[PDB]
Amino acid sequence: LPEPPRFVETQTVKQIWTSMRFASLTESIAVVCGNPGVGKTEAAREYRRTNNNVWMITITPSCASVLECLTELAFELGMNDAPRRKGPLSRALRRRLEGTQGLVIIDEADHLGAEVLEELRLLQESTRIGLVLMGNHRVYSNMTTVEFARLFSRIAKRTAINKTKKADVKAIADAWQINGEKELELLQQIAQKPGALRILNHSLRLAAMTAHGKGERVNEDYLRQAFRELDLDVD
Amino acid sequence: LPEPPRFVETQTVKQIWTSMRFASLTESIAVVCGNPGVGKTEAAREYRRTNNNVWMITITPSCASVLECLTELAFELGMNDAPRRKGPLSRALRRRLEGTQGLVIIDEADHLGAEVLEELRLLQESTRIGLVLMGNHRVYSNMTTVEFARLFSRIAKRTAINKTKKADVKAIADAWQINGEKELELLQQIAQKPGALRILNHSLRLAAMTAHGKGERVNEDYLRQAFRELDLDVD
Ligand SMILES: Nc1ncnc2c1ncn2[C@@H]1O[C@H](COP(=O)(O)OP(=O)(O)O)[C@@H](O)[C@H]1O
Ligand SMILES: Nc1ncnc2c1ncn2[C@@H]1O[C@H](COP(=O)(O)OP(=O)(O)O)[C@@H](O)[C@H]1O
After folding, report:
1. A151 within 8 A of A181, measured Cβ to Cβ
2. N or C: which end of chain B has fewer CB within 10 A?
3. Given strand A54-58, what is the order of strands in its sheet?
4. Which distant-in-sequence residues (6+ apart) come within 8 Å of A156 by Cβ?
5. In this structure, what are the phi and psi dihedrals at residue B116, rounded to the nearest 5 degrees?
6. First CA to last CA across chain A, in angstroms?
7. What value, to the nearest 5°, has the Cα angle with vertex B6 and ends B3 and B11?
8. How far does the CA of residue B146 sit from the closest CA of chain A (Å)?
């Protein structure tokens, strides 16, 4: 019956915002490698929505060149007059982006070319801004250090989020007005399976729409039917 | 008038033999990077002459492949029936060389390919023998560690010989029957200039042949004329 809230502040959200503002004021590189679907991507957008001098792209592996990725960052900076060459684009980024005290957020940092991440790290360095890397744990695996040596020397605050915590789903249940202890344990058990935040959010939205269509309150059995869907135990 | 001695035991010779026997009994890798002409090449040959289960090649950059270098080591092992392919040669080295408790000495380790030194390190490891690297200080510079990471994990005893010592040239003067303190200081000053052992040996041999041709004893002025040759201050 109430409006579903899309985003909730969580212990991971608190941690990752402190890491984000750390790389902001620190003006240095923060790599966030974690298990898939730990909720990092969404929080980054909440940081972008709440804070000034913040930018974010995503990297599809289609846009995984230096040219394409810097073009993406340039259009995110609003310079629609960006040149299609590498060089003058790099110069335009260097003139535009330095002195703003900003924070670049880059998601899926595993698909970075060495020249790609190389130009990014030398950018932020020659720009006095923030760069923050996201994605899975292949990002730190791509460094483990003569090709990534000075970059491993840059690294300010890595934060690994493997899975959720109990206060994480507890604040989730607080935001979704969930009071059952059986409900809380079931939410925790759903959080034990991967795609944690996503599956939990899906399960929450299934139960909310089912209880709204039936005119009832979200309860434990709606959550059981929701989790009984999705083919999680079906190969 | 006496016979010139070709080789003299020296503090560097003592140090480097202890490093050599260390990598022998240890059956592990010892990198000897030093200034050019520190006398390391000759001592290695004295170790080869005095000790059993010892082998040595040199690496010209002509023979700088895996195939050519392992062929050189194979002919040094006396297997003249060595195959001209990489694989069966590697197998023949693996069968021949394991169980002998030997010591391979490799000179000019700066011209090693990554596959070359790679096959050498995996050889000694799969062979329970000794490998010892020689040459200038570019050998350690080629490692400074994801391409050379496990190799930098192998390293047992690096010994850097930059220049000579005073007991070095003192034992040289003892072997060459030199008693002058002016002579000793002049020998030390010659040792301060690069190509130390080589120039000193050249100077010793110039003075010996000049004093033998003039029927006299080697003295300070013959050493001065010898050092006045060679165009050391002439560009
Ligand atoms: N605080 C939150 N509240 C609700 N859903 C969240 C929250 N944080 C993340 N999510 C969910 O996580 C997903 C977005 O991030 P996600 O895809 O998990 O990132 P990544 O795949 O990079 O780990 C969406 O399902 C989103 O609803
Ligand atoms: N103990 C020694 N006695 C006399 N000459 C020596 C001695 N050790 C080295 N040398 C001289 O050094 C040279 C051989 O080694 P060298 O060429 O200096 O090795 P590297 O070039 O690898 O440093 C020759 O000039 C040799 O006569």
Report:
1. no
2. C
3. A29-31, A130-133, A103-107, A54-58
4. A22, A23, A26, A28, A29, A30
5. -70, -60
6. 34
7. 120
8. 6
